[PDB]
A paper describes a structure:
Recent years, many agonists have been synthesized to stimulate the activation of β2AR, and some of these ligands have been developed for the clinical treatment of asthma and chronic obstructive pulmonary diseases. Formoterol is a selective, long-acting agonist of β2AR, which is unique as it both has a long-acting bronchodilator effect (> 12 h) and exhibits a fast onset of action (1–3 min from inhalation), suggesting that it is effective both as maintenance and reliever medication.
Herein, the cryo-EM structure of the formoterol-bound β2AR–Gs complex was determined with an overall resolution of 3.8 Å. When focusing on the structural details of the orthosteric-binding pocket, we found that the catecholamine phenoxy moiety of formoterol formed hydrogen bonds with Ser2035.42 and Ser2075.46 in TM5. The alkylamine and the β-OH in the middle of formoterol formed polar interactions with Asp1133.32 in TM3 and with Asn3127.39 and Tyr 3167.43 in TM7. Moreover, formoterol formed hydrophobic interactions with receptors through V1173.36, F1935.32, F2896.51, F2906.52, and Y3087.35, stabilizing the orthosteric agonist-binding pocket in the active-state. cAMP accumulation assay revealed that mutation of the hydrophobic amino acids F193A, F289A, F290A, and Y308A in the formoterol-binding pocket decreased the potency of formoterol. Taken together, in comparison to the structure of BI167107-bound β2AR–Gs, the attenuated hydrophobic interaction between αN–β1 loop of Gα and ICL2 of the receptor, combined with the disappeared polar interaction between T136 in TM3 and R380 in α5 helix, might decrease the coupling interaction between β2AR and the Gα-Ras domain.
Numbering used by the authors:
A (entry chain N): 1 to 127
B (entry chain G): 15 to 51
C (entry chain B): 7 to 26, 29 to 140, 142 to 340
D (entry chain A): 10 to 58, 208 to 249, 264 to 294, 308 to 320, 331 to 352, 354 to 394
E (entry chain R): 30 to 177, 179 to 239, 265 to 340
Amino acid sequence: QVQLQESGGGLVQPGGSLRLSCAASGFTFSNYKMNWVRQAPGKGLEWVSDISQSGASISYTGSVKGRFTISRDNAKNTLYLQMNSLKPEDTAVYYCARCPAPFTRDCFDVTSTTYAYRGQGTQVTVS
Amino acid sequence: LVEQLKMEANIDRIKVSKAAADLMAYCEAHAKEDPLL
Amino acid sequence: LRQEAEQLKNQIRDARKACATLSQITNNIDPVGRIQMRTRRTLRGHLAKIYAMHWGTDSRLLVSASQDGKLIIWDSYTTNKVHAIPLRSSWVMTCAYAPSGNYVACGGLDNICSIYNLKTREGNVRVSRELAHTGYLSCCRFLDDNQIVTSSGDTTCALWDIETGQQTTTFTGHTGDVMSLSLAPDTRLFVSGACDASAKLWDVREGMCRQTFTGHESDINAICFFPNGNAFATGSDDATCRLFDLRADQELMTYSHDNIICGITSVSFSKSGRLLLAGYDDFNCNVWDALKADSAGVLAGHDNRVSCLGVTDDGMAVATGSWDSFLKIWN
Amino acid sequence: EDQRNEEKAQREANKKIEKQLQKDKQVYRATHRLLLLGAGESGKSTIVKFETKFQVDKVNFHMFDVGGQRDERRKWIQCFNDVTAIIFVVANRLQEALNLFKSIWNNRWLRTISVILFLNKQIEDYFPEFARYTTDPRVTRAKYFIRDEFLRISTASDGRHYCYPHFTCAVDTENIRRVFNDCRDIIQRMHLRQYELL
Amino acid sequence: EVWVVGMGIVMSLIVLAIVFGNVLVITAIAKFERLQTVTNYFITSLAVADLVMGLAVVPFGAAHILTKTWTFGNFWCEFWTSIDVLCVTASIWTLVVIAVDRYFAITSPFKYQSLLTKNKARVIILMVWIVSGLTSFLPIQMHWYRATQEAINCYAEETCCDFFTNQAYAIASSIVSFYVPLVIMVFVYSRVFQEAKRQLQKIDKSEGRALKEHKALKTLGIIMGTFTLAWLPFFIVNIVHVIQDNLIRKEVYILLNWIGYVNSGFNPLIYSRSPDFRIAFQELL
Ligand SMILES: COc1ccc(C[C@@H](C)NC[C@H](O)c2ccc(O)c(NC=O)c2)cc1
């Protein structure tokens, strides 16, 4: 069984700083391309970040460039999304999604429902 | 989900020392009729 | 309720770890040695990618299905196109052959499974009863000449009854695609792979799971069933075949070679269950020992992929229909 | 000796099917297929044009459609690897399209398919690079920035397949020639790059 | 002596090259079951039409230089001269049909895959090996080249291996063997370069972010020049030696016949330049 849990999060005023984690066990972590995904309560799923399978090719969405910083850890089996300088429209449930195939260069994971490598997801809001 | 976990956890589970022996013996007895080996 | 589910799952994990690899038991048994086999006949008849072939029960015929809009009932002793059944659903993701050599099944992206009657009495081969699922239809099988247990991408295996075309039963509970399914030889219970690493077994009569599994790291492409019934193998997208078991709620060995990273595309056993075939994605077709896992003899013959695989009901002639329109009947 | 009649009975079926297949292949290799993923068209396949055939200059096109299909696309898209041109009607919103397009590109079986494209939608809060980029401009900036982003995704994989971005928002009368003329180029380049001549 | 020991190696390495560069194009097609396509039957017609050139003609046309006089006789020196002018015309018309093939496949892309089938690429080849025979094997048996006059001393008399054609055969042999294929394989490649210089100009109208516009020229070079430069001087020396005379030596008419008999050893190093061939060339030896 594959297990993808999270940590951190809560309620912080603008300009705060959250550092979310993700506990991945069950599968070898060194060769699966990961990515985070946030769902605005009252809206469909969106996209925030990703990462290659060596921390090399980090990407981001449009309005989240520079602020955050994602970084894997291929020995401790974690994925940390350091958040900086939040905003009013950054309240959402944050899932630690994954991608289906090993040794891949593509993702088909931001789906309406029915995905089996996408954790429960903590909540992060702004006051 | 929880009902299914319970109704699947309340059944019998034979030992590996007994299941692997059967799996081995079936092949060891059918290897004769097996022509592709 | 989620915490209670976690507690129950921890209990199941503790039980399945307390009730627990066949290698430590069978480590001195005599091996099989090297073995290779050559293409006896090359059924070069198709004109698109061959996506499935249910090797018939007669151990002679075979039905191959390709995206060209054709369904050709081949032969394996003189290599002749006994029939050529055209389809209206240009794509085909599976074919199925009745055990009494009396029916065939089809159906793919067009969501509809269909039934062609070949033992007719008026000439042309006509569609008997096309029955309809919201999603593609990625498998079909036959219990008797009028009972088909289709899979779907709708996440729901759904046993049918061709007479009056109804869902006698209906299975569900996967939350994910359902790629492949097998059937026990005694035809009473059947595993059903999926796209959640969930090789959930089922029961044909009632309509609910009996003892599920989850032991893979990616989706399951194709599944099998041991010749007796007390075992079943499984392939996935992480280049691994895993000899599961349905008497101990766990597996018994993992097949994996560090030299290859690709995705299994179809599996099937031999008669004695000794040689575990496999259709990989780097164009070859390995063979694996039963309880002495090692890549013994690579049957690399194809040139694009290996889309399916099959073995005669008396273990005589494997036949792998690749993606370049050419079957190949090994021996 | 009585076993010498079924031989001819079987060889006649053989020699009739090897006369029907050599006459069906000549209509299988004269129609090029398509695909219309990314979004249902309803403006480019129903009003201007699950098969949906048509014809331009004595050639027919099996313009398929996956509108009735599900969301998870990793299983019924690996069996379209023999099509010639994956038409792509497209109008956060755009980032989802971009992350679908990057995956269709870097896929392993859809690797060598020449993705045609269609900006049917013919902003700065979701895109901060909008101010540091330069080609009334109130429409040209947006249009050409979206197209430049798509082409910056397309020109990083090679040379076996190129994105052909077009634009259409009007009644789309001649929106079929923009596919015919631009599907001719894919065959031309598929031959040139193979003759080591381009 | 070196004038009898150099031509024993320089005119033998060529033989080895001819015979060894084309076994690798005959076997690597008759073996692999995935090359036997419509535009790789042509190249087999091109590899046999030089395997013969290097197995029957050249090893004989080398001992004919070493000895300086025929040895087999006349029932062989009238068949060898008739097989050589057949082999050359075949191995040029194969190039012209491949050129018309490519031209159609690039200027009519919707129709080359449909209106040119595996059953229609054998009429073409057994029409080319007839346009070669009808003009290089029968006009030698029916003696339409006897050159009716200084060959009467040795050639017709006895044991004199020497080509002697007339002002009506050595002209309608050239105008059929090298001046139709030349014009056709120039009008084809002009119209193919005019499109390789447009599908490399429509690219840089949207993307691109004489460097690479000179790849559609190096390959036209190594395909068309290596043929024109190799078979033009011989088939102008023929016309000149016919219209004028005594202005050209046999020691030149025999050097051109070897600046020509290597354009039939370069072809399996020019037309086998696709990755499929370059990969299949491994398992052979
Ligand atoms: C005098 O010593 C010799 C000995 C042998 C040759 C070979 C010559 C016939 N090869 C001819 C060549 O291979 C060729 C090719 C195509 C043609 O149309 C013609 N026509 C000649 O009149 C000729 C020539 C001169």
